[PDB]
Design a protein around this ligand. Sequence first.
Ligand SMILES: COc1cc2nc(N3CCN(C(=O)[C@@H]4COc5ccccc5O4)CC3)nc(N)c2cc1OC
Length: 277
Amino acid sequence: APVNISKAILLGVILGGLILFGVLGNILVILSVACHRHLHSVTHYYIVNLAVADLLLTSTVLPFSAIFEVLGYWAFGRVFCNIWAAVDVLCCTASIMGLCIISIDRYIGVSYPLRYPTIVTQRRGLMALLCVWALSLVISIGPLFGWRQPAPEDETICQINEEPGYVLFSALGSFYLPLAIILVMYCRVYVVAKRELLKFSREKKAAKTLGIVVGCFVLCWLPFFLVMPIGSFFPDFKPSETVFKIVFWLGYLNSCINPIIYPCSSQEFKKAFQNVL
Ligand SMILES: COc1cc2nc(N3CCN(C(=O)[C@@H]4COc5ccccc5O4)CC3)nc(N)c2cc1OC
Protein backbone atom coordinates (compact mmCIF):
# COMPACT_ATOMS: atom_id res chain seq x y z
CA ALA A 1 0.00 0.00 0.00
CA PRO A 2 1.14 3.59 -0.58
CA VAL A 3 3.17 5.14 2.25
CA ASN A 4 5.12 8.32 2.93
CA ILE A 5 8.14 9.09 0.75
CA SER A 6 10.29 11.61 2.61
CA LYS A 7 9.68 10.15 6.08
CA ALA A 8 9.97 6.58 4.80
CA ILE A 9 13.15 7.40 2.88
CA LEU A 10 14.73 9.03 5.93
CA LEU A 11 13.75 6.12 8.19
CA GLY A 12 15.13 3.59 5.72
CA VAL A 13 18.37 5.53 5.37
CA ILE A 14 18.92 5.79 9.13
CA LEU A 15 18.09 2.11 9.66
CA GLY A 16 20.40 1.07 6.83
CA GLY A 17 23.14 3.15 8.41
CA LEU A 18 22.52 1.36 11.70
CA ILE A 19 22.85 -2.08 10.08
CA LEU A 20 25.94 -0.96 8.16
CA PHE A 21 27.59 0.26 11.37
CA GLY A 22 26.68 -2.95 13.20
CA VAL A 23 28.00 -5.18 10.42
CA LEU A 24 31.20 -3.14 10.20
CA GLY A 25 31.73 -3.38 13.95
CA ASN A 26 31.11 -7.12 14.10
CA ILE A 27 33.37 -7.80 11.11
CA LEU A 28 36.04 -5.63 12.72
CA VAL A 29 35.78 -7.59 15.97
CA ILE A 30 36.04 -10.91 14.13
CA LEU A 31 39.03 -9.80 12.05
CA SER A 32 40.79 -8.28 15.07
CA VAL A 33 40.42 -11.50 17.05
CA ALA A 34 41.34 -13.81 14.16
CA CYS A 35 44.18 -12.07 12.31
CA HIS A 36 46.04 -11.08 15.48
CA ARG A 37 48.00 -13.89 17.11
CA HIS A 38 48.24 -12.32 20.57
CA LEU A 39 44.42 -12.22 20.88
CA HIS A 40 43.89 -16.01 20.79
CA SER A 41 42.07 -17.49 23.79
CA VAL A 42 38.82 -19.10 24.86
CA THR A 43 37.56 -15.67 25.93
CA HIS A 44 38.34 -14.20 22.51
CA TYR A 45 36.73 -17.25 20.89
CA TYR A 46 33.57 -16.49 22.87
CA ILE A 47 33.91 -12.84 21.81
CA VAL A 48 33.97 -13.85 18.14
CA ASN A 49 31.05 -16.20 18.81
CA LEU A 50 29.08 -13.22 20.10
CA ALA A 51 30.29 -11.20 17.11
CA VAL A 52 28.99 -13.87 14.73
CA ALA A 53 25.67 -14.04 16.59
CA ASP A 54 25.05 -10.30 16.53
CA LEU A 55 26.40 -10.08 12.97
CA LEU A 56 23.69 -12.52 11.93
CA LEU A 57 21.26 -10.43 13.99
CA THR A 58 22.36 -7.31 12.10
CA SER A 59 22.67 -8.81 8.62
CA THR A 60 19.47 -10.84 8.08
CA VAL A 61 16.78 -10.12 10.69
CA LEU A 62 17.58 -6.42 11.06
CA PRO A 63 17.33 -5.56 7.32
CA PHE A 64 14.08 -7.52 7.12
CA SER A 65 12.66 -5.56 10.06
CA ALA A 66 13.80 -2.31 8.45
CA ILE A 67 12.14 -3.23 5.14
CA PHE A 68 8.95 -4.18 6.98
CA GLU A 69 9.02 -0.79 8.72
CA VAL A 70 9.60 1.09 5.46
CA LEU A 71 6.80 -0.79 3.69
CA GLY A 72 4.57 -0.91 6.77
CA TYR A 73 3.57 -4.52 6.03
CA TRP A 74 5.12 -7.90 5.32
CA ALA A 75 6.13 -8.41 1.68
CA PHE A 76 8.11 -11.67 1.67
CA GLY A 77 6.72 -15.19 1.85
CA ARG A 78 5.05 -16.70 4.88
CA VAL A 79 7.87 -19.24 5.04
CA PHE A 80 10.22 -16.25 4.97
CA CYS A 81 8.26 -14.68 7.84
CA ASN A 82 8.60 -17.84 9.93
CA ILE A 83 12.32 -18.13 9.14
CA TRP A 84 12.72 -14.44 10.01
CA ALA A 85 11.12 -14.91 13.42
CA ALA A 86 13.10 -18.10 14.02
CA VAL A 87 16.42 -16.44 13.15
CA ASP A 88 15.57 -13.44 15.34
CA VAL A 89 14.89 -15.69 18.33
CA LEU A 90 17.90 -17.89 17.57
CA CYS A 91 20.36 -14.99 17.44
CA CYS A 92 18.92 -13.12 20.43
CA THR A 93 18.92 -16.38 22.44
CA ALA A 94 22.37 -17.58 21.36
CA SER A 95 23.87 -14.21 22.30
CA ILE A 96 22.51 -14.56 25.83
CA MET A 97 24.07 -18.00 26.36
CA GLY A 98 27.27 -16.72 24.77
CA LEU A 99 27.23 -14.11 27.52
CA CYS A 100 26.46 -16.88 30.02
CA ILE A 101 29.57 -18.85 29.09
CA ILE A 102 31.60 -15.65 28.89
CA SER A 103 30.48 -14.94 32.46
CA ILE A 104 31.38 -18.46 33.60
CA ASP A 105 34.80 -18.15 31.92
CA ARG A 106 35.36 -14.74 33.52
CA TYR A 107 34.41 -16.13 36.93
CA ILE A 108 36.91 -18.96 36.45
CA GLY A 109 39.63 -16.58 35.26
CA VAL A 110 39.12 -14.05 38.06
CA SER A 111 38.92 -16.69 40.79
CA TYR A 112 41.85 -18.79 39.48
CA PRO A 113 44.18 -16.55 37.44
CA LEU A 114 47.30 -18.75 37.47
CA ARG A 115 45.31 -21.99 37.16
CA TYR A 116 43.01 -20.51 34.50
CA PRO A 117 44.74 -22.20 31.51
CA THR A 118 44.48 -25.58 33.27
CA ILE A 119 40.68 -25.36 33.70
CA VAL A 120 39.22 -23.52 30.68
CA THR A 121 41.41 -25.19 28.08
CA GLN A 122 41.00 -24.85 24.32
CA ARG A 123 39.19 -28.18 23.95
CA ARG A 124 36.88 -27.50 26.89
CA GLY A 125 36.21 -23.98 25.63
CA LEU A 126 35.19 -25.17 22.17
CA MET A 127 33.08 -27.94 23.72
CA ALA A 128 31.24 -25.37 25.83
CA LEU A 129 30.79 -23.13 22.78
CA LEU A 130 29.27 -25.97 20.75
CA CYS A 131 27.02 -26.98 23.64
CA VAL A 132 25.82 -23.37 23.92
CA TRP A 133 25.11 -23.15 20.20
CA ALA A 134 23.14 -26.42 20.26
CA LEU A 135 21.17 -25.46 23.38
CA SER A 136 20.42 -22.02 21.92
CA LEU A 137 19.15 -23.66 18.74
CA VAL A 138 16.96 -26.03 20.75
CA ILE A 139 15.53 -23.30 22.98
CA SER A 140 14.96 -20.95 20.04
CA ILE A 141 13.18 -23.35 17.66
CA GLY A 142 11.46 -25.56 20.23
CA PRO A 143 8.55 -23.35 21.29
CA LEU A 144 8.24 -21.90 17.78
CA PHE A 145 8.55 -24.87 15.42
CA GLY A 146 7.24 -27.36 17.98
CA TRP A 147 4.25 -25.53 19.48
CA ARG A 148 3.08 -23.47 16.50
CA GLN A 149 -0.30 -21.73 16.41
CA PRO A 150 -2.69 -22.06 13.45
CA ALA A 151 -1.28 -20.16 10.49
CA PRO A 152 -3.05 -16.93 9.50
CA GLU A 153 -4.84 -16.81 6.16
CA ASP A 154 -3.14 -13.51 5.20
CA GLU A 155 0.22 -13.61 3.42
CA THR A 156 0.93 -9.94 4.28
CA ILE A 157 0.74 -10.47 8.07
CA CYS A 158 3.91 -11.34 10.03
CA GLN A 159 3.09 -11.04 13.74
CA ILE A 160 4.47 -12.40 17.02
CA ASN A 161 2.86 -15.24 18.98
CA GLU A 162 0.74 -13.51 21.63
CA GLU A 163 -0.37 -16.69 23.42
CA PRO A 164 0.89 -16.72 27.04
CA GLY A 165 1.93 -20.36 26.74
CA TYR A 166 4.64 -19.38 24.26
CA VAL A 167 5.74 -16.00 25.63
CA LEU A 168 6.25 -17.39 29.13
CA PHE A 169 8.41 -20.28 27.91
CA SER A 170 10.39 -18.10 25.51
CA ALA A 171 11.10 -15.39 28.09
CA LEU A 172 12.05 -17.97 30.73
CA GLY A 173 14.34 -20.08 28.55
CA SER A 174 15.83 -17.25 26.47
CA PHE A 175 16.30 -14.29 28.83
CA TYR A 176 15.32 -14.83 32.46
CA LEU A 177 17.17 -18.10 33.09
CA PRO A 178 20.38 -17.18 31.21
CA LEU A 179 20.05 -13.73 32.77
CA ALA A 180 19.89 -15.23 36.26
CA ILE A 181 22.95 -17.36 35.50
CA ILE A 182 24.80 -14.26 34.27
CA LEU A 183 23.90 -12.24 37.37
CA VAL A 184 25.02 -15.06 39.67
CA MET A 185 28.32 -15.45 37.84
CA TYR A 186 29.02 -11.69 37.79
CA CYS A 187 28.06 -11.16 41.43
CA ARG A 188 30.62 -13.87 42.15
CA VAL A 189 33.09 -12.11 39.83
CA TYR A 190 32.52 -8.76 41.54
CA VAL A 191 32.92 -10.14 45.06
CA VAL A 192 36.03 -12.13 44.11
CA ALA A 193 37.63 -9.17 42.33
CA LYS A 194 36.95 -6.79 45.22
CA ARG A 195 38.00 -9.17 48.01
CA GLU A 196 41.16 -10.29 46.20
CA LEU A 197 48.93 -10.38 40.11
CA LEU A 198 50.32 -9.78 36.62
CA LYS A 199 47.76 -12.26 35.26
CA PHE A 200 45.04 -11.49 37.82
CA SER A 201 44.95 -7.89 36.59
CA ARG A 202 44.56 -9.06 33.00
CA GLU A 203 41.65 -11.31 33.99
CA LYS A 204 40.06 -8.44 35.91
CA LYS A 205 40.37 -6.11 32.91
CA ALA A 206 38.83 -8.70 30.58
CA ALA A 207 36.06 -9.26 33.14
CA LYS A 208 35.36 -5.52 33.25
CA THR A 209 35.16 -5.31 29.46
CA LEU A 210 32.84 -8.30 29.17
CA GLY A 211 30.79 -7.00 32.09
CA ILE A 212 30.26 -3.73 30.25
CA VAL A 213 29.19 -5.76 27.20
CA VAL A 214 26.79 -7.85 29.29
CA GLY A 215 25.34 -4.77 30.97
CA CYS A 216 24.72 -3.14 27.61
CA PHE A 217 23.04 -6.29 26.28
CA VAL A 218 20.82 -6.71 29.34
CA LEU A 219 19.83 -3.04 29.38
CA CYS A 220 18.98 -3.10 25.67
CA TRP A 221 16.94 -6.31 25.80
CA LEU A 222 15.21 -5.87 29.17
CA PRO A 223 12.35 -3.63 27.94
CA PHE A 224 11.18 -6.20 25.38
CA PHE A 225 11.19 -9.14 27.80
CA LEU A 226 9.47 -6.91 30.38
CA VAL A 227 6.73 -5.63 28.05
CA MET A 228 5.90 -8.90 26.24
CA PRO A 229 5.16 -11.13 29.27
CA ILE A 230 3.41 -8.20 30.95
CA GLY A 231 1.38 -7.58 27.81
CA SER A 232 0.30 -11.21 27.66
CA PHE A 233 -0.40 -11.62 31.40
CA PHE A 234 -2.29 -8.33 31.89
CA PRO A 235 -5.34 -6.66 30.33
CA ASP A 236 -3.00 -4.26 28.53
CA PHE A 237 -1.85 -6.11 25.40
CA LYS A 238 1.30 -4.31 24.24
CA PRO A 239 -0.18 -0.79 24.36
CA SER A 240 1.10 1.66 21.75
CA GLU A 241 2.44 -0.93 19.31
CA THR A 242 4.75 1.91 18.31
CA VAL A 243 6.42 1.48 21.71
CA PHE A 244 6.57 -2.27 21.03
CA LYS A 245 8.53 -1.44 17.88
CA ILE A 246 10.77 0.93 19.86
CA VAL A 247 11.61 -1.79 22.38
CA PHE A 248 12.54 -4.22 19.60
CA TRP A 249 14.73 -1.56 18.00
CA LEU A 250 16.39 -0.75 21.32
CA GLY A 251 17.10 -4.46 21.73
CA TYR A 252 18.59 -4.65 18.25
CA LEU A 253 20.73 -1.59 18.99
CA ASN A 254 22.96 -3.74 21.21
CA SER A 255 24.20 -5.59 18.13
CA CYS A 256 25.81 -2.33 16.98
CA ILE A 257 26.69 -1.09 20.47
CA ASN A 258 28.77 -4.17 21.30
CA PRO A 259 31.69 -3.57 18.87
CA ILE A 260 32.12 -0.07 20.33
CA ILE A 261 32.67 -1.56 23.79
CA TYR A 262 35.77 -3.61 22.96
CA PRO A 263 38.01 -0.68 21.89
CA CYS A 264 36.51 1.81 24.35
CA SER A 265 37.10 -0.58 27.29
CA SER A 266 40.18 -2.62 26.28
CA GLN A 267 43.36 -0.88 25.14
CA GLU A 268 44.50 -4.13 23.51
CA PHE A 269 41.34 -4.21 21.41
CA LYS A 270 41.77 -0.52 20.60
CA LYS A 271 45.29 -1.18 19.32
CA ALA A 272 44.10 -4.19 17.33
CA PHE A 273 41.30 -2.16 15.74
CA GLN A 274 43.69 0.68 14.91
CA ASN A 275 46.26 -1.63 13.31
CA VAL A 276 43.70 -3.71 11.38
CA LEU A 277 41.99 -0.66 9.84
C1 LIG B 1 14.42 -13.48 21.67
O1 LIG B 1 13.43 -12.49 21.62
C2 LIG B 1 12.34 -12.83 20.81
C3 LIG B 1 12.19 -12.22 19.58
C4 LIG B 1 11.07 -12.57 18.76
N1 LIG B 1 10.92 -11.96 17.55
C5 LIG B 1 9.88 -12.27 16.76
N2 LIG B 1 9.76 -11.61 15.48
C6 LIG B 1 10.56 -10.40 15.13
C7 LIG B 1 9.88 -9.56 14.06
N3 LIG B 1 8.48 -9.66 14.18
C8 LIG B 1 7.57 -8.65 14.70
O2 LIG B 1 6.42 -8.89 14.73
C9 LIG B 1 8.05 -7.27 15.21
C10 LIG B 1 7.39 -7.04 16.56
O3 LIG B 1 6.01 -6.98 16.48
C11 LIG B 1 5.54 -6.15 15.42
C12 LIG B 1 4.20 -5.68 15.45
C13 LIG B 1 3.72 -4.86 14.43
C14 LIG B 1 4.56 -4.52 13.35
C15 LIG B 1 5.88 -4.99 13.32
C16 LIG B 1 6.37 -5.81 14.36
O4 LIG B 1 7.73 -6.27 14.27
C17 LIG B 1 8.05 -10.92 13.72
C18 LIG B 1 8.84 -12.05 14.39
N4 LIG B 1 8.97 -13.18 17.15
C19 LIG B 1 9.08 -13.78 18.33
N5 LIG B 1 8.09 -14.76 18.75
C20 LIG B 1 10.17 -13.48 19.18
C21 LIG B 1 10.33 -14.10 20.45
C22 LIG B 1 11.42 -13.77 21.25
O5 LIG B 1 11.57 -14.38 22.50
C23 LIG B 1 10.76 -13.82 23.49
